[PDB]
Amino acid sequence: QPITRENFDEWMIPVYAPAPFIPVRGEGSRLWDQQGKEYIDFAGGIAVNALGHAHPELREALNEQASKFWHTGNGYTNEPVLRLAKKLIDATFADRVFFCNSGAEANEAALKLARKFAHDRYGSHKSGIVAFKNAFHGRTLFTVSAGGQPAYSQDFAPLPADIRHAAYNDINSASALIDDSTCAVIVEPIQGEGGVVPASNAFLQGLRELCNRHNALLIFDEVQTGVGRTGELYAYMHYGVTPDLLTTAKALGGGFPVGALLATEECARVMTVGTHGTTYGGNPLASAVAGKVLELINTPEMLNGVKQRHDWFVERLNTINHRYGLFSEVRGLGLLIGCVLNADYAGQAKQISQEAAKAGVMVLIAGGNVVRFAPALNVSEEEVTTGLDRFAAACEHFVS
Amino acid sequence: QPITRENFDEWMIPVYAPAPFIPVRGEGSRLWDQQGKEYIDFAGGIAVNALGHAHPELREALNEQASKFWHTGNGYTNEPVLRLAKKLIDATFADRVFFCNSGAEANEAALKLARKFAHDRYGSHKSGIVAFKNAFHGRTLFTVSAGGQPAYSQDFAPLPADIRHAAYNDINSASALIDDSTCAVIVEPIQGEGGVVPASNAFLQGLRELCNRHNALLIFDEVQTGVGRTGELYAYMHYGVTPDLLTTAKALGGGFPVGALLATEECARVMTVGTHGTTYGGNPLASAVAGKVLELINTPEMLNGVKQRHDWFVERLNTINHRYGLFSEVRGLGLLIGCVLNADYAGQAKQISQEAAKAGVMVLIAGGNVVRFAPALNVSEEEVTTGLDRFAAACEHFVS
Ligand SMILES: Cc1ncc(COP(=O)(O)O)c(C=O)c1O
Ligand SMILES: Cc1ncc(COP(=O)(O)O)c(C=O)c1O
Ligand SMILES: [Mg+2]
Ligand code: NA
């Protein structure tokens, strides 16, 4: 039979309430549903589709590797995964890489590593993880425990112990929870799902200093801010603060499920044979696509084109706002942007987002108070503009 | 750029010591390395590539969805994921499914669901998970804590609490750890990684009765035993015991990263909006490939073919064994097969598997005492007979 939106409510464990309409194909930043209706996509796969939909180069790298082999599992290395490791190593502070299949898997590896590193060098008691309220790090028991949203963790207790949460951008708060017993501090350089809130340069530099004083590993969760999103390859290059461990996923594979953990030689050393692993991680199909993604994103032209796009979005969202008075602030960095709703409209992000979709434009929320834009890094000027026209018309209807 | 095996030792976090040769392509059950050497592949992707390397239909289904769209994140459903969900529902005891990226993510979803379920119907004190010594269920902190190889978890303490391990196949062992505080019992229908140990029928009925008496969810981890592996679509069907949750990954995707949680209506009801999720899970690329795998594997010809192929392997392993006296036993079901080394060859499975690679056959281990075979369910009669000739050669060298 045909497939209907009402099938989703009989067949899926109900953790999501997705859009009333169902996408069937797309190209760059346009996407179309089963009845031909056209959307401009500023969701961008939740900051994943860095190169837009059905990119011809990503396709050709896909079918080219797909016609050789897809997977053997990690008893055997492959050429694409090694080339992909080299690109990441050459391009970042990393000296070594582990590949996995999601952002949570990447953060599981990172927290595992910092645990074993501290145990091995200082002893079993040094196990403290400090993370930040409002953080999101994934949905595995360990990563959702690391996450700063107790409503996502509470139901699944007992939670792994020795995790504590400081207030984001609050140096003294973090300082109070970081002592010689801390093995890791995990922080997103911009909080993503928690509202598109960027770190300040002094906050990060202060976490770097605290980690050094207390021999703790600093982990940047760059799952959302990485691979071009901010206008440098990783947000840490923008802030100018270097972590011991950096995690990466989402846009890494331009839509193919991939993630990775980047590490210094010193940290890498501690993960000996059999101490972590993954069936699919490092397959050559993912690795061929991620390799092409990095080839295309990590160029001066694409990245400066991200800085430029930030200004086309912020200028236009600013003039929409003057006209309609929805938001108190447009914030973020590169093409991760949040519109903060005002006192009159607070908690209403999702209704604006639903209006947007009726008007032909896909936008995200980030908590009930922020409308979040995470479009393709190659969205064209014409796409930004027509998308923002439809968002204008939706703010129109919404504001009454 | 030049790529060599010594690059693996410099670029990769060193959790794997993989083969000294590097695959570059395959077709059916043959694989070829960078120098053109040819291997018969009885490792099967570690029971993932259920239809062999580079399958033309799996590439046609891949290229087809790749050219419409790959990903949106789960704010938007898609036709291939729904169709995949409905195949799974139509073919098993399930009413709903959840999609993720890996068998560990599948098992996280099932262990989370069992905990919330307990908590919501009886109170937050009912949190206990019973697993089995030598089980493998993944590398996330929660799932490696549920698996029964403490060597894989101890470095990463403190572990999530309330987990206990009973002895596999020992119903009194299980009985002593399962009580009214238990939310779940999770078990592999054949322990895979732990030696290719099949469950007995009485053992699995015993856990179903115990879970019934104590109101605990029974979870079959069919990540390895799933999707045709045993000669039935899923092992639980061979055994006539029905779980409350089943997890599936590996061969589900024929090589593409995908996994699923299969649930009855009453368990699915428990995971309400926002209580869980995943960026990549359920994308249409994965669902389009898995959809195709299910279609090609779930037929009476493939599945009976897996019964026939079991006999090819065992008839011939027996005659190798008659010549070299290596194995006390040949065990398993359909195409998961463990050859158990004799006391005179105890702990030498990996050495055997190295010799087999030298002779052009890829095989696995399952602990140091079992040689494991997990080939493609569509492996040909010629490929079986050529691979065993080489495995026989490799046995002869090994015995001197
Ligand atoms: C910053 C950050 N880290 C980790 C994750 C978990 O990623 P995944 O959904 O790929 O498992 C997400 C997803 O929202 C995220 O935004
Ligand atoms: C029975 C079983 N469950 C779960 C897993 C974890 O699967 P993955 O490596 O896909 O995360 C494995 C992998 O070895 C397995 O054999
Ligand atoms: Mg609730
Ligand atoms: Na069913």
Author numbering:
A (entry chain A), B (entry chain B): 3 to 402
From the paper:
Escherichia coli possesses two acyl ornithine aminotransferases, one catabolic (AstC) and the other anabolic (ArgD), that participate in L-arginine metabolism. The arginine-succinyl transferase pathway of E. coli provides nitrogen for growth via a series of succinylated intermediates. In conclusion, the E. coli AstC protein, involved in arginine catabolism, is a PLP containing transaminase that is structurally similar to the related protein ArgD, which is the transaminase enzyme used in arginine synthesis. From the biochemical data, it appears that AstC and ArgD are biochemically similar, consistent with the ability of astC to complement an argD deletion. Both have comparable steady state kinetic values, with a strong preference for the acylated ornithine derivatives AO (AstC and ArgD) and SO (for AstC, at least) over ORN itself.
